[PDB]
Structure 1
Amino acid sequence: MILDTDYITENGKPVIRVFKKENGEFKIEYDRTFEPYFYALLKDDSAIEDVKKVTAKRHGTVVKVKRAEKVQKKFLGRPIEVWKLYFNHPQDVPAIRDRIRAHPAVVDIYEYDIPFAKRYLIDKGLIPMEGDEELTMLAFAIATLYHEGEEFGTGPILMISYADGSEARVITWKKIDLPYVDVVSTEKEMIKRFLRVVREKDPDVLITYNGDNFDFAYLKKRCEELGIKFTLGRDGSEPKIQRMGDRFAVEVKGRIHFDLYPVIRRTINLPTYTLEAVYEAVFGKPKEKVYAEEIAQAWESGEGLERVARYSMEDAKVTYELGREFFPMEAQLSRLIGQSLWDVSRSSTGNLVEWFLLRKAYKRNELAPNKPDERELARRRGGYAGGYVKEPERGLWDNIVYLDFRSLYPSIIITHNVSPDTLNREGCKEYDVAPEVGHKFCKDFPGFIPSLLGDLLEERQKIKRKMKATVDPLEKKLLDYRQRAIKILANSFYGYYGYAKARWYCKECAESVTAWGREYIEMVIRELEEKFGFKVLYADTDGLHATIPGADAETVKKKAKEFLKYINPKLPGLLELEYEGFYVRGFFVTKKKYAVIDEEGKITTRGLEIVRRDWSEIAKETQARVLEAILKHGDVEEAVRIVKEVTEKLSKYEVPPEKLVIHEQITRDLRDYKATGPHVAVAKRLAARGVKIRPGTVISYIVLKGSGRIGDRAIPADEFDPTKHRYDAEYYIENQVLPAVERILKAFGYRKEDLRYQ
């Protein structure tokens, strides 16, 4: 099984390394034969003789074109003749590419920014993570001596916990009488023992939770302070701390550093992403949190360090269990994209689509278009029309069927051959013409992306079958994440068409897909309501809720299924409308916001404050209870009583602060907020107190009693002292609870005055 590639430099020449696991043995394979290259398109071939003479000077050594070779390739399906320029070292390509491009005979250059080791994986047809090879894994975590406002890493590490399938242990340097603690003499000894555990266990995978940004950097700093070589690489190397935008990522040569946070952050939607909150969300069970003060208070007194050791051991054990659950999903994406698990687990979905396309283009001899320059970016700025959203019917409806197209946009792309290499391709036998926007797509030959999307859909359907048949609820949920992941990837091929920085950008493709989408769903709404007696209650892009007014549950189900058998034979290609759900009762508040209840009594909520991380829990809890009373008990006065009870508790300061916290992400550097709302105001004030705030920081705040700008009374949630400050009851009533529940209860004739406390 291939894990990763890189290259090293020996005597000026690049040597590729393939890291592999085979029959239980770790192997490094060296390849000295691979030559870096890019392509130049010339005004004509006589110019190759002058183009070959372009040089560049890098660090006092002359970079030259090693060898030029004329090749025939396709570009958007059309023959093209380009010159393949070979070089003696990968660094030669960035040193020379601008000067090759500036040559007056050179129309353009291509495939000049592809990292050498990834170029090798693609060109040699190598797919990481293929095979039945069983890989060993090891999680670890650290506990540090923290005091607020010191520079990063000034405090000693106190404990290092690690866990695999067989054990979970804590290494520390103070006496804790627990069976899973190993006490050693010093912090230096603790780290050195951790290093030996990893050398001796020799895991293929190292699992952390935010190791990219905290754990490895802390260890590195302590190793520097104590004079330790931080050997974890299988080749003796230290961890390599590469930059990724505003964050970092940490590589361990010969192993896969699997940092869970990026994967968790993009898979699960939570208001905060503590390890405790993630563990609870995945496994449905609590994890205790011991805080930095509690840690420091224990360390400096000697007392109650058992709890700290327990907390550390659980960190590692939970990190391991989370790692085991999610690794198969990342391994599969790794095989689908053809890049290392280390890369795919950290990559944006945009880069994944691009890397997939680059590989497939190589197999097809399709020259890749370039990422756009600033001028082309500028001319790509226009938007385009998206999906149709029907304003919902007001009120409480019974016997609601939910119908929804399977993999709609990908299905449109394949069925209508929507691709840049088919757009307005001239002199063709057959065309599909997009409605409204008019773009013509040739059907004579399969388009590049259309030809690739099917397998993705089949891969998703294969997972979905395994899911719906899987009994164990935890495995079923992880299979649900997995099938959603392949679904999001498939739809990201559509979105890639309208992505400004995309290589195979094609706005005409993007807007053709949405245009077909609007026509299909509006045709379904029309057929249902004009011919089959349904009332469509709500509709969003490719799905719809409908009922037959006055009909019993089984009549609606029967007519809905009859409609599916009437409509689907009339749909072209892969287009299929699916029966997705039936709800005995349901309520549509506005576009994007509704709630239904199935025959088993489960309420499904969309878009309502219940669902959002940025509303307080007292607002979301109360909304949930109101919805249950209405949807499950039919009882609206209970709902009203519920609200009136909660507003009475807020007034009397009888609601606990936890339910008052608002959570909002900082999404950008603090300095380029054009407007400063509460979470930004809090952030900036923490920033001024020397706290690192960066994109992805989740601000947690509570609004104190006062008047004026909310931002002037918002404080960090952890600073709310219920004795010294009092929360702003009026704010939580009139700005949190009542807006959330009034949007529901107004349907029943209730006004806010009906809901407040005396």
Structure 2
Amino acid sequence: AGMIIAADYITEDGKPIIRIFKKEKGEFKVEYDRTFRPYIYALLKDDSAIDEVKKITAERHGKIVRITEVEKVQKKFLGRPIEVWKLYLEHPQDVPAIREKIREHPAVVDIFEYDIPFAKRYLIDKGLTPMEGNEELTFLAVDIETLYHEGEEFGKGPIIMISYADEEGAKVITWKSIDLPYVEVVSSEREMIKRLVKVIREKDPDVIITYNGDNFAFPYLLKRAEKLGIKLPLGRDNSEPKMQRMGDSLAVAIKGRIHFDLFPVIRRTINLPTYTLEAVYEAIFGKSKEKVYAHEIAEAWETGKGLERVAKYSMEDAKVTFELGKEFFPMEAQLARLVGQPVWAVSRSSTGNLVEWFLLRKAYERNELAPNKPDEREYERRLRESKEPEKGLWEGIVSLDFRSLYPSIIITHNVSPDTLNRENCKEYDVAPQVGHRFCKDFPGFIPSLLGNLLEERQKIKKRMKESKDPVEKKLLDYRQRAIKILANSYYGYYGYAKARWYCKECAESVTAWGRQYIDLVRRELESRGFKVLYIDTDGLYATIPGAKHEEIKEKALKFVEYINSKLPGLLELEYEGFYARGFFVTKKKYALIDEEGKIVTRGLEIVRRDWSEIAKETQAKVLEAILKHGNVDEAVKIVKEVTEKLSKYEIPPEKLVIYEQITRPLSEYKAIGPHVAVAKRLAAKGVKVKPGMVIGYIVLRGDGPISKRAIAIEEFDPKKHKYDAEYYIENQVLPAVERILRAFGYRKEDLKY
């Protein structure tokens, strides 16, 4: 079978050619389409206006741009028939050149579908879905180790090891002598990079797995390949990996392949305070992994002693990256297929953007004109548009999930922006408290799609019970899971300020109808002896005060079984889990500990390089005292001792360092924060300050804002300089612990002597 893995376009004689990358019975095939044309829609005041509108012109690449053909089309907008004009263009890059010239026009009411990338336009319009079929893909995990010294410019240090892994095993390429069976010793950094290029071209993997290869491995490989005057022909068309700007960070694509970066995937899928490969591997496979820190790698490389340890670490990084990629790719592949967009894009998207891509495709299928994304003004206005947890430390906490309730509410009440407050509506549903009216006269666009999604999931689930084949059961399990994830993202999407089908009234109405079921669950739990400690639209936490843990579990499992049997249709409550202890601060700010001693928090931990070690160490100690020791008095004593130690200059300066990256040329800064004031002084000294550089600084005692009192760590002398104890107490240590301790009745002022 022919499986689409990606799509893009190339220009030939100034004209666009769509490229469809396929895997057909184990073979890479590239299909070319020259006939598909770019277009936008324009809603005109009157049909007569088209004569003036079709004559609109623009300029691109020195040459003028024209509307190639115009077509009157009948579509649906806001659940109403609408007549719009399809404005065809020669090249997709013509659209950003001419769209505002068309929008400007006095006879143009509005323009639509003017920001849809050409390759995604093609996939939607041609009814093409990526990752369909039983086609078996090949995978290769790739990792690199670099020589790093404190605060160096990105790419100054050479790549010292390159590792890769597949089903054949994990291997290391290095340019220093190491006697291990899996180590390939080459002569230079140049020859090691060329060997990675050779491995990739020979193995010809369909998927390249990395752990943060978007921001580290590939940008570094590209930087070192540039310095060394060598190419990286990793694309199946011999093109080099392409760095793309996604937000403030990067995204790397390899043409004809899927660069599958696990880092954005795992960050979305699982909840951890740190996303180190070691923490992630232990969380998924329950196995320990050793870390070899940058300073240890530098010492081993420079001394030539203890290099076997470094090569074992590099080899394991690839081996576990391969194991994790194989664990997480099947789900990303089913989400790709379900939304009808490539894995590359889907693996790097929020669920809100997954819903939008599903909706855009379904809009084309149903002849529905898509609403536009908001302008800066509308986006801000949406962000402006508008139960309390139990205090103390609780034991034996049961977690219940409400999320599978909302798709059913959207369908039954026909909650959709196209059904909201319709004029001359015969029958409508009124939302409780909020009072929004949703027309019953026709099924809304979103309710209609959701119903089909939920029906399709029930069919898959029925096929799973009636299947004797463990292979299709595995594939169908990922399919029903992908639908559940997509369906449960619709509620959130109605409220997403960047959404096309954004509807505040829809989100409130679903919250209002949802609340009746939440109040039922809360009441039925409370009559069973349960105390509800935390409730949000997503779920709740409860316990039976002073009851045995097995009894809390048994009663909770019995309770979900009971409620689901009382709730009509596909309305479903889910038992998420059990926790030995936990405390709750506010909405989505809480911390729990499971029976295996794993701490799980939401909106509290500060495990980041721009927070000093003293603040992170104290916060970890406070959480451990509370969750592992069940002792809030110990936690308060920890803070009081640390702050006194800071007052008396008893804390080592290494625990006071703040790290912040330089992201621009120094002259481009508008606000000069401490790291920039320090960076400007270094540049003045002759230091090559470049974006990517990470500035380590300590805040000293004195007058003025912190920026004037910050010193570079390399300039800090414990004899001459005195750190600002008030800054480390009030701006570092106390903010790190004050939110946690507020759950127990302490204010900032109670945490000192």
Q: Number of residue pairs matched?
A: 722
C-alpha contact 1:622 1:737 (8 A) present in aligned 2: no
Conserved 8 A contact 2:252-2:259: yes
Give the structure 2 partner of residue 423 of structure 1.
420
Residue aligning to 1:539: 535
Give the structure 2 partner of residue 473 of structure 1: none
The alpha carbon displacement at 1:29 in A equals 0.8
- Greater mean deviation of Cα atoms: 416-425 or 718-727: 718-727
Whole-Å Cα distance in 2 between the matches of residues 565 and 180 of structure 1? Answer: 52
Q: CA deviation at 1:423?
A: 0.5
2:250 corresponds to which residue? Answer: 248
Given that residues 5 and 343 in structure 2 are in contact (C-alpha distance below 8 angstroms), is that contact kept between their aligned partners in structure 1?
yes
Residues 15-36 of structure 1 deviation map (CA, whole Å, 9 limit, x = unaligned): 1111011111000011122111
Matches within 5 A, 1:110-259: 110-148=112-150, 150-259=152-261
Deviations 1:195-239 (A, max 9, x none): 222111111111222222233233333333333232111112222
Answer yes or no: is the 8 Å Cα contact 1:517–1:542 preserved in 2: no
**Structure 1 72/324 Cα, relative in aligned 2: closer, same or farther at 3 Å?**
same
3-state SS of paired residue (1:212): coil
1:120-519 map, 5 Å: 120-148=122-150, 150-377=152-379, 379-384=381-386, 389-392=387-390, 404-454=401-451, 489-519=486-516
Q: Structure 1 175/436 Cα, relative in aligned 2: closer, same or farther at 3 Å?
A: same
CA distance in 2, matches of 1:455, 1:67: 36
Mean CA deviation greater in 105-114 or 216-225: 216-225
8 Å contact 1:617–1:659 — kept in the other structure? no
* Counterpart code for 1:540: D
Structure 1 residue 374 displacement after superposition: 3.9
Q: CA separation in 1, counterparts of 2:19 and 2:119?
A: 8
Distance 1:518 1:159, change over 3 A: same
Shift of the alpha carbon at 1:658?
13
1-side partners of 2:296 and 2:545: how far apart? Answer: 61
Counterpart code for 1:122: I
What SS is found at the alignment partner of 2:215?
A: helix
| SS of aligned partner of 1:235 | coil
1:106 is displaced (CA, Å) by: 2.2
Cα displacement (A) at 1:584: 8.9
Does the CA-based 8 Å contact 2:76-2:367 persist in structure 1? yes
Seen in structure 2, the aligned counterparts of structure 1 residues 668 and 458 have a Cα distance that, compared at 3 Å, is farther
Counterpart of 2:82 in structure 1 is 80
With over 3 angstroms needed to count, the CA separation of the structure-2 counterparts of 1:278 and 1:646, relative to structure 1, is same
Identity percentage of aligned residues: 69
The CA distance in 2 between the partners of 1:150 and 1:612, in whole Å, is 22
Superposition deviation, residue 460 in structure 1: 8.3
The CA RMSD over aligned residues, in Å, is 5.0
Paired letter, 1:432: D
- Give the 5 Å matches for 1:595-674: 607=602, 616-630=616-630
Structure 2 gap segments, 5+ residues each: 465-475, 683-687
Residue 32 of structure 2: aligned partner: 30
- Alpha-carbon offset, residue 352 of structure 1: 2.3
Which deviates the most, 282-291 or 412-421? 282-291
Would the alpha carbon gap of residues 187 and 120 (structure 1) be closer, same or farther in structure 2, given more than 3 Å must change?
Answer: same
Aligned AA for 1:430? E
Q: How does 1:31-70 map to 2 (within 5 A)?
A: 31-70=33-72
Cα deviation, residue 74, structure 1: 0.6
Change (3 A) 1:686 1:346: farther
The verdict on how the C-alpha distance between 1:593 and 1:65 changes in structure 2, with shifts beyond 3 A counting, is closer
The answer to whether the 8 Å contact 2:678/2:710 transfers is no
Displacement of 1:119:
0.6
8 Å contact kept, 1:243–1:249: yes
Do the aligned residues in 1 keep the contact of 2:530 with 2:543 (CA within 8 Å)? Answer: yes
Range with greater deviation from structure 2 (357-366 or 451-460): 451-460
Shift in alpha-carbon separation, 1:82–1:739, aligned structure 2, 3 A:
closer
Q: In 1, Cα distance between the equivalents of 2:60 and 2:287?
A: 58
Q: Which moved more, 1:655-664 or 1:412-421?
A: 655-664
Tell me if the contact between 2:677 and 2:708 (Cα under 8 Å) persists in the aligned partners. Answer: no
Partner of 1:471: none
Q: What is the CA deviation profile of residues 264-300 of structure 1, one whole-angstrom value per residue up to 9, with x for unaligned ones?
A: 3333444444434433444444444444444444444
The letter for the 1-side match of 2:402 is F
Is the deviation greater in 397-406 or in 230-239?
Answer: 397-406
Q: CA deviation at 1:675?
A: 10
Instruction: For 2:183 and 2:80, locate their aligned partners in 1 and report how far apart those are by CA, in whole Å.
Output: 66
Aligned-residue offset at 1:138 = 1.4
Distance, in Å, in 1 between the alignment partners of 2:479 and 2:629 is 34
Is the 8 Å Cα contact of residues 273 and 605 (structure 2) preserved in structure 1?
A: no
- Counterparts of residues 550-565 of structure 1 (less than 5 Å): none
Please report how far the alpha carbon of residue 110 of structure 1 lies from its aligned counterpart in structure 2 after TM superposition.
1.2
- Aligned equivalents of 2:717 and 2:462: distance in 1? 51
Change in 2 beyond 3 A, CA 1:340/1:663: farther
Alpha-carbon distance, 1:657 to partner: 8.2
SS at 2:5 equivalent? strand
Amino acid at match of 2:495: G
SS at match of 1:309: helix
Cα 1:515/1:691, change in 2 over 3 Å: farther
TM-score under structure 1 normalisation? 0.79
SS of match in other structure, 2:449: helix
Question: Would you say the 8 A contact 2:699–2:706 is kept in 1?
Answer: yes
Q: Secondary structure at the match of 1:407?
A: helix
Of the structure 1 ranges 194-203 and 723-732, higher mean CA displacement relative to structure 2 is found in 723-732
Instruction: Give the direction of change, closer, same or farther, for the CA distance of 1:524–1:342 in structure 2 (3 Å limit).
Output: closer
